[PDB]
Amino acid sequence: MKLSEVRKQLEEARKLSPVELEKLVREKKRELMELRFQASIGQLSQNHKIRDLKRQIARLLTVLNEKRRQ
């Protein structure tokens, strides 16, 4: 993902609530499964997408944790 889009993800994420973070992670985890399936039948040429999503989910969960941590 582009560095600027990462900052953007963090700012937008940091504005969210725990619950909104949970919904969004769950959606991204879903979107990853779709990607996995496509990789397995050979229809995902754009395979950088998998590394990306996995890190968005990390970043989000990382932030969720920030939120709950205090």
Next chain:
RNA sequence: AGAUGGUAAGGGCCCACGGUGGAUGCCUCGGCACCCGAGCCGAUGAAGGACGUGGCUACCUGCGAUAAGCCAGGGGG
């Protein structure tokens, strides 16, 4: 009558060139010694592991379902 040479199945010595083999010289990612520095970790679960972890991944390294990585500060260019 007499007498003396060309035989090489193969062998031997020498010479040339090779094959095998990995000495020797040079080399060094490594080791060794001394000196200096520095010296605890663990229930906030250690040391050390198992199994995982990559779009394609046998192994090693890294990492832990947030899985060759997540956030922030500093450095660097």
